[PDB]
Symmetry: C5
Subunit: 361 residues, 5 copies
């Protein structure tokens, strides 16, 4: 199609052909090439790459995480790139731990330690990242930290009357929880443990008040003090949660995926393209945080839905005017936050189940 870099057939063939497409390679070059200003230049706490892109500080933790989930799949696709993905993941962990990334926790007034109680959006991502790094590299560099954080998450789940952990105090999100639970499966695979036994209770919990099973859509958020559930449904919330859950209980996500597509996905331009509504009671696409379409593109990949992948990418990429200069990829007009991050991830994503069964080196 016009304005696109490579065929959907090409993206889905990467694992089989044991090589990334030339446009994915040009994204790894943006990530790795230029001294000082590339995001994966060094382990140091410098965020020049994110300053140049105008990434708000609250989002930096999400950007580092999504890069890392992408790099994990790259390690599976081309074993000649596994050592590079490893080095990039070592840097990802190193930068995730800087105060610039987690410091919003202290400034808001919630505490001086980001890993001690609550804050499941930050520490969920960190714990999954610790695990993927060790699956890719076979390095014990972060094992002591990984065991400490895994145990904190296990003890907090055990002690709570609802199934899971909160983000900021009295804010419960199904997305962030999905990341935490997956991080337990990764630890179990590495150590032979059974922390993932908590998962069944969590899956039963989110199916009670936190989902509308007719529409296959989760509600925005839950608040344990009042017991309140915000009465709007969210596409970006649901796309992200179902994608992560597919790697733990594939039957759960397969049950709801069709109703999710019915509820939010708009096909247009005689079936060539698709865009995703963020909530119900509107005609508008990519409202709220504006990430409905981009997370759906990751879900489509996770579920092997070639048709929807192609439709969404035909909507997302061409207007953003991509260009390759000195073998490096840039976008002249990115359409949302986390843009180059989520398109990178969706193009390479091998499935969360596959990342769990990653053959060691």
């Amino acid at each position: 199609p016009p304005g696109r870099l490579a065929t959907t057939e090409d993206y889905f063939a990467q694992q089989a052909k044991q090589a990334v497409t030339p446009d994915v390679m040009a994204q790894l070059a943006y990530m790795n090439y230029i001294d000082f200003i590339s995001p994966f230049y060094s382990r140091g706490c410098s965020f020049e790459a994110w300053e140049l892109k105008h990434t708000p500080q609250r989002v930096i933790k999400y950007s580092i995480a999504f890069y890392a989930y992408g790099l994990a799949s790259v390690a599976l696709i081309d074993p000649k790139l596994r050592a590079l993905a490893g080095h990039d993941l070592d840097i990802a962990v190193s930068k995730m731990k800087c105060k610039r990334v987690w410091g919003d926790w202290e400034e808001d007034g919630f505490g001086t330690d980001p890993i001690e109680k609550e804050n499941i959006m930050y520490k969920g991502h960190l714990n999954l990242m610790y695990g993927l790094y060790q699956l890719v590299t076979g390095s014990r560099r972060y094992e002591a930290e990984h065991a400490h954080l895994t145990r904190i998450i296990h003890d907090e789940i055990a002690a709570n009357p609802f199934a899971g952990i909160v983000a900021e105090p009295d804010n419960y999100f199904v997305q962030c929880n999905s990341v935490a639970y997956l991080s337990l499966w990764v630890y179990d695979r590495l150590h032979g443990t059974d922390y993932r036994a908590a998962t069944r209770a969590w899956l039963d919990f989110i199916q009670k008040d936190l989902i509308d099973p007719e529409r296959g859509a989760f509600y925005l958020s839950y608040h344990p003090e009042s017991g309140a559930v915000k009465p709007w449904i969210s596409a970006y919330t649901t796309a992200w949660t179902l994608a992560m859950v597919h790697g733990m209980d594939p039957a759960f996500s397969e049950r709801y995926y069709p109703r999710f597509k019915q509820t939010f996905v708009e096909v247009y331009d005689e079936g060539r393209k698709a865009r995703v509504r963020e909530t119900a009671g509107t005609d508008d696409a990519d409202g709220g945080v504006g990430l409905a379409s981009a997370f759906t593109l990751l879900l489509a990949r996770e579920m092997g839905d070639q048709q929807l992948f192609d439709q969404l990418l035909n909507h997302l990429e061409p207007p953003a005017k991509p260009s390759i200069v000195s073998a490096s990829l840039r976008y002249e007009h990115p359409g949302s936050l986390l843009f180059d991050e989520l398109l990178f991830l969706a193009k390479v994503h091998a499935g969360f189940g596959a990342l769990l069964r990653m053959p060691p080196p």
Copy 2:
């Protein structure tokens, strides 16, 4: 439906009966609750991104959080399926009200390091009413120890003063701020069976002596106990706000003056379709001073069941501000004053201060 309007006056007044908010009020609760980090009721942390994006002056933030809270109280009465949400929003309102960014002007001006210990009745009046409404909506004891402490300070300060009430900044007496303090005593009494509201009679007799012009049904700007001075201008926004709050405590008082107030300040225009409110006497100009005369009159109209004036004022206020609903969330492209989305939200849902006092429990 007049042009540029979102819903009929009949629709707004029917919300309690139909036991559901209008679709435009729901889209306002979405602005308040939906977007991560930048919505005003995202979390109980001390972050005011929502107010930075709206360009709110720091001295006014305390008023914005309060008026949101009075609105959320009525939403809890209208639709019991929303009461838990209103409760969570009110918990966040109290939490943010207590941050130094909100009360810190008190210290910076040089008046003291503690905002509740003495005087400062504009800030702590609002806080005390908020503590009470949160407990009426939720049945939660989370803030009860703080509520008792502040209520007792207010009772002891009233008792000790030779005039009836408490000052804002030292030697500044305002009837608006006092009205909020006294109402907060009625809310405490309803929760605990006490009789702090016995102070109300003396206060109502006091403000009717030198602080009102009873011919025009308008309070004077301010009183200053050291000199005994009363600033010689009358104020619409002051009067609209005071009569609205007093209506919940002594309905006869506000019903006596409401007609003279409308005569004194309200201009009907555009063949009766619209109204706009003058801020003081001796001028033809509308919404002078702090520019909130019209918007507080819209709240008074609602409080006193006046459908006609409500419709006229909203026809003046809303259409020029160019509202639009996108992804089921309400924005205004050109808000006409400070506290805009706050006072229109409040006026559209407001169930009457009397009704908030008699709010049935949750269990």
Copy 3:
């Protein structure tokens, strides 16, 4: 006749005391001063200067702005007894704000000391001492009496100790304007307490008439510097207009002697006698040079001396170009011509004479 761009007749301004009411434009100025929460200059006793930030007042001038507002408020208390309690409350706030560090702090930053009253600094503390006294004449309140006695005694002891007659501003800077304010503040204390601190005034009047005036031109020299004995060799209109106005309340014969030569030396009448503007120094045709306040202080002098003709001429020059407008019963100027503009026009319009402020009858019960 009402000339164009003017709000009220000169006849109207001079009749205020007789009619026992301020003009509607003076009332609209008191509304600017008092009405709006937070941003009006007389909102509270706190140390916030939002009113002055919005007007772009440089910090070194804030002390002058609060003082000239206060001298105006004193006359308003004489004009309309129904406004005297309001003037009192405004004066309480004036004193309170005068004492904030934002107002006097230039003294410390420049390196002259950490206390602004202890010694020298007669521009700041002269104004403060007169303000303490006017507050007590208007209100009958003893709120500031202990402070007033302490500062009055500092000024008395410093005059007594100096070989020249008076006190310096910054070290080794002697200005006749600032001194005039200090000496007047002693007359105010004497009136309240029955004392005789004003006995110093004669020596001071003899001193300034020696080297510090050109008696041919009826004009004081810019400044004197006691270490070197130097007198800056330029004469100053704003200096002279301000000094003669204040002295008129203490020794009226002194100011009456020089007023005609002062007008000859600096005042240019133009536009067929309808208008006047004031040159700041000699050897130029340019008006309102230097600090640009020659014309505005002359307008105050004309009022002090009962010269209705010159008052009218100056105000015809000053007000219309500044494009005044009344909105919601409050006065603003869209294009003020100088610093201290709304302050000095307010003062000149209401000013009852410094003599009259001294004889202010006590408050009602």
Copy 4:
């Protein structure tokens, strides 16, 4: 014949040593460097960086700017003995400013440590160690000798202790460029003291020829990372031009083996052979990508290898678009094409060969 927009012939630049005088445009560059009170880069030994503020030099690059000035000044000392005392004074100031926290402080802010010399950080301390030595060759001054011995010994002990040949920059970042500077700095110390620290060089040359070079294309890979063992899979022109230039002074046969394949791989001749520009990596037609210094480092390599033709071609590409002007006998560029512009063109024009700097005769 003088091509258009150029200040002097290639023949003129290569003749400087023989004629025992710098060209008038090189002299006008020394005037920019030395003339104006306070704002010239070589005004005083103080920690003031006004010259670099005016030019908008990012702080991470200041260490490179001071170093390249210093390598240039060393050759100026060889060309014209009447200027050797001036070069010495400029080099004393170069060292003095190199040691200020403004220059090395990125190390601490990044979180890597409070001492920039103690371990790793081979980009900063490699440059410093070479500068310490060139200063002493030019002047014969022992001012910095105790510091030079301490840093040389640190570098020797760190090489000895590492399982790969060389030292990292930031932790777990290995660059062949930075290493090349460190090893050369050992040869300079040996020449001054009669020691044998340069015995480490052979192992290093054998190491970089294993996984860190593609010998078919005569191009080094971007970087190596010892923890993972990863080699970033792109080749780099600026990396290779700089490395071959420095290595030529230690093992000339090594650089002579790969120089032709390097030119084949990256250099584009155009405008009927009058001009050249350099691609930064493979799989592109674009010139001077990445840090945008491919062409400028190739110009230094061409000089090092005595390749007059390529020198002329590159300078015809680089100088005229940058619109140079000489005013009151001082050089400025109205539109410099990259970072480190006046620095690398200065260096390339005077460069006498790294071998010649090593054999610099005493001051007399």
Copy 5:
């Protein structure tokens, strides 16, 4: 004499001021700029406020020069018109007071050279201060600063005695003949006040600067000397030479008379049929007022010092008219000053009575 276009007063008028015992009306209007307006005039008070210099956009490193040149001017004003001598005194008292503020000398500490600006080196700052202390006491007869003057004079005498070259450095290992000239003159001033013989050091200094630091064929000093390396920067400087010869003329008039003609040959360009002149800053260029851009303005001071009415007129015809002067409310401003220190050096040149005459200033 006819008034050339854009000029305020004839050269004949400026040179007659001492004889007529009155300053021109344009000099008086400059003293008004200096003294008239509350807070923002440069000589308002002894306080450490620099509003006058903020409004003019004076860089902080230059403030010390601005206060000094005002002070040299005010000294001559005291000689011209005895009715102005007490005013000049008061202005000089303020000059000293402000010279001592950290805003003026603090660059010394920030650059890292020490916490005390007087104790050692820093001859540009303390030379000026010492001459100012002396001129204040010649004008006023006041002992206010005498204890400080004796302390600083002795420091300068003891540092000269201890150095193997003749003089004192500015910032470490920077030797300038200009700054030295100010220090030595300040010794002559002390001697005149106290009957001492500190000026005996002057002969050795004059012999020193005539060895490597001057080209006697061109009558021009070299830019700077650097004692560690022994290097002399190989460019000659007009502003350096104009300033040095002007100050030396008060100490050894024969020295300055020997070189003045060769100086004019070397740098001064007459143009517009002899009506105008402008001064080249160095050799090997046609450009005027390069570098710090003060060649012409310091030459105007030298012309005055040497009684050369012709060159004075030519230079002022070049400098003043383009700067578009205007007198408003009897005060002088320039709409478009041509350089730094503009109103300062034109003020000085117009009143300057000769450094010899300042030395012989009769008591008050």
